[PDB]
Amino acid sequence: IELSLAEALFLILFTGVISMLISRRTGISYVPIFILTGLVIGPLLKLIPRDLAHEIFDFVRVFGLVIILFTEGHNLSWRLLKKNMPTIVTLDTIGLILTALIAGFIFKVVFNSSFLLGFLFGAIIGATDPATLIPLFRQYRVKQDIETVIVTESIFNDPLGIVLTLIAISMLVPGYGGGIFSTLSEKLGIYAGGVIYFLYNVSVSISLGIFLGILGYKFIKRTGIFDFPEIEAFSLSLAFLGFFIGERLDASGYLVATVTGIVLGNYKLLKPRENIRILKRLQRAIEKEVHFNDTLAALATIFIFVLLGAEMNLEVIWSNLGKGLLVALGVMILARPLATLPLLKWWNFREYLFIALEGPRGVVPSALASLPLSLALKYKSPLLTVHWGEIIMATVVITVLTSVIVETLWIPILKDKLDVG
Amino acid sequence: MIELSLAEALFLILFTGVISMLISRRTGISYVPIFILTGLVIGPLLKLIPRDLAHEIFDFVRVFGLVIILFTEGHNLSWRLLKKNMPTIVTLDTIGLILTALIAGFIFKVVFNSSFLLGFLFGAIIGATDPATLIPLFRQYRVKQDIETVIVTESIFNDPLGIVLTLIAISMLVPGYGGGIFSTLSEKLGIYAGGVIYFLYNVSVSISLGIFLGILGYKFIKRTGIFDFPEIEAFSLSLAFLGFFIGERLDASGYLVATVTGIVLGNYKLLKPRENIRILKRLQRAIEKEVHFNDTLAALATIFIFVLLGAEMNLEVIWSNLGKGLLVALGVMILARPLATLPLLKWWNFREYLFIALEGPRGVVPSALASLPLSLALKYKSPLLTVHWGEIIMATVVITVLTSVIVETLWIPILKDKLDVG
Ligand SMILES: CCCCCCCCCCCCCCCCCCCC(=O)O[C@H](COC(=O)CCCCCCCCCCCCCC)COP(=O)(O)OCCN
Ligand SMILES: CCCCCCCCO[C@@H]1O[C@H](CO)[C@@H](O)[C@H](O)[C@H]1O
């Protein structure tokens, strides 16, 4: 009486729900709880096969990522962005890159891998998910501007961490470069081609995202889309429209969708103020939309973390426990602050250090974690090996768990030393 | 016709569907023929959605969509109004349904040479009703509250049972679904008596279990204080599907379990007579948000169902038996439905009865079950049902849906004028 695929998916959902409940009730972060649940229903009870978790992940990756990043777009205020523009821009143009690179050198050293493979690991481990941190920021009443900068940086790095990961793989394997990557690389080498392609991708993604967000907003006003179930379905369709159009012209559809989310989140700012009645109407609409889509992003998160927990291979992670652990603490202590370094050039050091140290790794790399493995199994290419895929995945899991728990636990005392003085 | 990705296909269905939804609400036209026409456009007309792919999508949207749609439907039922018109409701969902399916089987078998089981399958498919496209005209013309309650509740119970009957007709024609309680009972007391007793069994067990998991659900939520986003939505979805799978493992329609669960959750006030208002407030709000989510999902499911149905038909078979199918549809509307609706017309004035009869078209559930016999034919090679006959059934169902919906949504003012002088 083994579980069918439907009962399997549902098992993931239900178990994830219970895990969520006990997580909230107890006060423990949802990340290691969801991972734990994964291992429980996974390799332990063998209720869910890892080789199936691969494919379920092959859907939940694209879907969940797009919807989650889109939902993240809404929680961004353009005002606070432009007010603290340089800091954020540095955090999402330099700090990310340097984090990924140092992390890559670390990986290369610890596992004797290539620096390109390490760069893949770093690109995966680049983005940050502080959604695990926020409740403590609130209940300990940390600086509002700090929370602003951190959260904003995350919202921006989540899709950037992806396109970074897509770069490294595109370098390792020329499979489905799209055309832009292929052309730009064949004209200006692999690395420089990667740089200019990064610039291109970012440019077109931001542009198209803003464009589609605005046009969608205006479309809503014109056609009058404020009532159930039009607003939800339309907004969803808009997000995935941005994603598919973006990916169609070789741009990060994730980033596009995120940007669209930012636009809709800042609908009150872009076009002329209407009468308070209309503003309230649009407000209600956006509230409904946000509700539905954020519910979807919640489910998606649950599935991502649980699947990851049920997909890992115990023997591989144990044979490299210490190694990947020191890679984790290595990137938490050495990489992140080193990359953060130019912050104190425009910030106070006591601020800069907290901002550096605090940022952990979360959902996005957890989704990207199995990608190199699955891609290795499928494409079956010599450059990246299946074993190294297992290595990557294991490491990513380790640094995710360790970063999350260490940040979550070391945050209280760290305020006392940085607030009081 | 450049090949799309699977994801691009799904998204295309979504986008086009939403566009057609907007257009539907704006123009005032029923969403059903707009959706189906849309699917037809992006389907065989443009070949952006290969029919094979359509089958593959519909094999998922069937399960997931139907479950969530029905579970959503459960919420909109009042036990009070049920008590108010209990015998009528029970009659319609039980007797009138079976009779409808049977007569439809007769007609279907008449139009072209077939087994009576094929026709019975056809009737069991279109057994359920969907007045969702009628309500905007009901409140528009201030129609009697009682009859609306009757029709709505009727459809609410007809949607799962219609599948159960469809589950029955399938169980006979295929050896796969055979092995089970139904096989035992039918072999024991003949196909007829066995069918009836398995009907009673499935209904009873599914209902009782749905009530059980419903109460257990409400009590659980009550104890662990599930009100804050997003615990409630996730837990609700989990609950509905739990009921589904558990119910299905006991050889009973899990859909019916989902519906009953939805009924239980819908009538939260009725469970505890006295409870301090605060609790009822938080509960009402949480339930409301949950309803928003699950109903949005239900809408998406509806769209996908109708559009997919639109893209899954082939104009060759459709045209080939065009007149035939039309005769079937008209036969069902004009003859079958009222003939099956007569039993408890004793409680209702003849004009009102003729109204109830002449109303109640076929929508979502038959649209989902339309391609079911074809898929099974393509997968299980029955000596009873063929692929082409699956095509005949799906086509006939499509025509039935279009005709019934369009007419019964369009003729309502005139009909009201006939029974209520105007
Ligand atoms: C994680 C993000 C959360 C939000 C996502 C949307 C909400 C879903 C949340 C998770 C739901 C948990 C509950 C599990 C649902 C049960 C799924 C049933 C799957 C199933 O059995 O499919 C089988 C085949 O699948 C196949 O053939 C594969 C078909 C491939 C296309 C599937 C695409 C699905 C997209 C649906 C989107 C529309 C829904 C509204 C969002 C059917 O096989 P059978 O038994 O019928 O075979 C015999 C007939 N001859
Ligand atoms: C079923 C037809 C109505 C569907 C829309 C459901 C309306 C739910 O409205 C809900 O009200 C809550 C009250 O705080 C808000 O917090 C939620 O954001 C909002 O979605």
Author numbering:
A (entry chain B): 2 to 422
B (entry chain A): 1 to 422
What's in the article?
H5 and H12 in the 6-helix bundle are discontinuous. dimer indicates clusters of charged residues on both sides of the membrane. transported by PaNhaP, K+ is not. structure thus serves as an excellent model for the membrane part of NHE1.
The structure was solved at 3.15  Å by SeMet-SAD. The structure was solved by SAD. ethanolamine (PE), carried over from the E. coli expression host.
